[PDB]
Enzyme design. Structure first.
Site, PDB file in Angstrom:
ATOM      1  N   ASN A  59       0.809  -1.227   0.000  1.00 34.97           N
ATOM      2  CA  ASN A  59       0.000   0.000   0.000  1.00 34.97           C
ATOM      3  C   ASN A  59       0.846   1.283   0.000  1.00 34.97           C
ATOM      4  O   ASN A  59       0.308   2.354   0.266  1.00 34.97           O
ATOM      5  CB  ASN A  59      -0.964   0.016   1.186  1.00 34.97           C
ATOM      6  CG  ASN A  59      -1.777  -1.249   1.326  1.00 34.97           C
ATOM      7  OD1 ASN A  59      -1.898  -1.820   2.413  1.00 34.97           O
ATOM      8  ND2 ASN A  59      -2.345  -1.720   0.225  1.00 34.97           N
ATOM      9  N   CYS A  71       5.867   7.355   9.264  1.00 34.79           N
ATOM     10  CA  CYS A  71       6.911   8.076   8.539  1.00 34.79           C
ATOM     11  C   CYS A  71       6.550   7.977   7.062  1.00 34.79           C
ATOM     12  O   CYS A  71       6.237   6.893   6.567  1.00 34.79           O
ATOM     13  CB  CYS A  71       8.286   7.467   8.828  1.00 34.79           C
ATOM     14  SG  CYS A  71       9.620   8.017   7.722  1.00 34.79           S
ATOM     15  N   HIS A 111       3.112   2.314   2.094  1.00 31.96           N
ATOM     16  CA  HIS A 111       3.372   2.832   3.437  1.00 31.96           C
ATOM     17  C   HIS A 111       4.628   2.160   3.979  1.00 31.96           C
ATOM     18  O   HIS A 111       4.904   1.014   3.624  1.00 31.96           O
ATOM     19  CB  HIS A 111       2.201   2.511   4.384  1.00 31.96           C
ATOM     20  CG  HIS A 111       0.954   3.279   4.096  1.00 31.96           C
ATOM     21  ND1 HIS A 111       0.801   4.586   4.513  1.00 31.96           N
ATOM     22  CD2 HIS A 111      -0.166   2.895   3.439  1.00 31.96           C
ATOM     23  CE1 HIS A 111      -0.390   4.968   4.079  1.00 31.96           C
ATOM     24  NE2 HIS A 111      -1.012   3.981   3.433  1.00 31.96           N
TER      25      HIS A 111
END
Ligand SMILES: CS(=O)(=O)NCCc1ccc(F)cc1
Ligand SMILES: CS(=O)(=O)NCCc1ccc(F)cc1
Lengths: 265, 265
Positions: free
Chosen positions: B186, B223, B188
């Site tokens: 995804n 992050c 991330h």
């Protein structure tokens, strides 16, 4: 995994993991490179090599090092799928050894990828190249096919192409790249798959989002130490072709050079 | 892998790979964390999930990690089989807990254990919210109703409150950036990358002479792909304890905090 009937090649099946895939839910080119590495280690383990240096290579402080790695992927295995990889080795006279791989879909049986690597002999302390003696050859030849078996047979194919040096100014760049402990192998050296990732870091995200990596050819010139900082440079040469260059962030010392070919999704 | 007879837990066997081990030729704490993640994904796949329930998808809600605690007695060697069992439990309206037991496939002895606390969150606004009744009924049918704790003990380290590291830090690793290999499907940053980042500020001498026994990590903020991280460590202590803090290199915004415990080899 297991050796074939003749004991001259090794096969292994892998189930693609959740964290091993990219945005398109298929294995990344680095997951594939890690799998090639794992089946190669298991092939050397199955033919006698302890935890792939021979007896003559141990007495003399000699190791096999990668000089070139070429990978061609037609289909990237999906998350949850089984990929079957077959690997073997061949003597290249006195220059060194070559290791080849064939990737197949375990369900359909069709070839979904292929790879070739050229390894050279080297003193692990001085880092001097040298050449495959004669006593070393006899120790590993008994595990190689004597007749040629090439994953890339074609006369005038991509895997044996000479790669030029990227001319400054580069079109794209990723600066300040540093290996972490996860990037090191069991011998505390930077794993060769990290260099593939570093080469691909300077490819723009738009190219990655709209294209798929078809071919990647990487030439290894020097090792990057744990405390070295790397700059990754890319320029479009064209399907899309790119010329790549990895160099030490400080003095600009060349560590890698290569080319990639991408296809529209 | 497969669910147990009662369908209230899942087991899976893994053969430790060549590139998955450190200098001791045993799996790294990040290889273990990736394996915990993989067996968790397979457990959700085997019970109907295409993580998100029917009501969660309707409301754009996802499960996010708030804490991860791992305790390892023995790190599996390269070539060994590790068997991991995982299950989930409702924590009322706070969220869910996922536990893991790691066993040696040969001896059958427990070699490690882990616990994680997950909270409900809107995918878009990033706002946390309590587990509604309609969501609870959709996942409770896959959880044991009687408590089943990997860390039962009265005053155990998995539920300890962690303080914030006071500047100046004793040790530091500055300018850490995620690459494409650090991202999940995804796009991330994968939660195992944060474990690696926490361990980057631990001095190499501590890593060479000690083994990681316990690690407790609290997740405060995600992050981004274009964010830069600073990793800070200070010794707090035969055994060594450390206090950790990950923060954005620029504004000093906190993303993670934790503690580690190490034992002499
Ligand atoms: C540089 S390598 O190609 O990875 N190894 C060369 C020696 C060898 C030859 C045949 C084997 F079955 C295993 C190892
Ligand atoms: C992965 S989790 O966030 O810890 N739990 C979510 C709900 C669930 C409950 C039982 C399952 F067998 C699978 C999922």
């Amino acid at each position: 995994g297991s050796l074939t009937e003749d004991g001259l090649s090794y096969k292994e099946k892998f189930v693609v993991r959740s964290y091993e895939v990219g945005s398109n839910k298929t294995a990344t080119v680095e997951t594939i490179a890690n799998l090639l590495q794992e089946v190669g280690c298991n092939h050397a383990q199955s033919v006698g090599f302890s935890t792939a240096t021979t007896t003559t290579m141990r007495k003399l402080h000699l190791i096999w090092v990668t000089a070139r790695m070429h990978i061609e992927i037609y289909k990237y295995p999906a998350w949850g799928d089984v990929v079957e990889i077959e690997t073997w080795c061949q003597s290249e006279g006195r220059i060194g050894t070559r290791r080849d791989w064939i990737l197949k879909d375990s369900v359909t049986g069709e070839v979904t990828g292929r790879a070739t690597s050229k390894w050279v002999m080297m003193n692990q302390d001085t880092r001097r190249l040298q050449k495959v003696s004669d006593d070393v050859r006899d120790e590993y030849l008994v595990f190689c096919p004597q007749e040629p078996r090439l994953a890339f047979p074609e006369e005038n194919n991509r895997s044996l192409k000479k790669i030029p040096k990227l001319e400054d100014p580069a079109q794209y760049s990723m600066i300040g790249l540093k290996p972490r402990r996860a990037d090191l192998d069991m011998n505390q050296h930077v794993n060769n798959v990290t260099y593939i990732g570093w080469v691909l870091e300077s490819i723009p995200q738009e190219i990655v989002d709209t294209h798929e990596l078809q071919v990647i050819t990487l030439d290894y010139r020097r090792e990057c130490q744990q405390d070295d900082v790397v700059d990754s440079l890319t320029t479009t040469t064209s399907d899309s072709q790119f010329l790549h260059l990895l160099r030490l962030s400080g003095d600009g010392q060349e560590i890698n050079r290569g080319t990639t070919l991408w296809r529209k999704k």
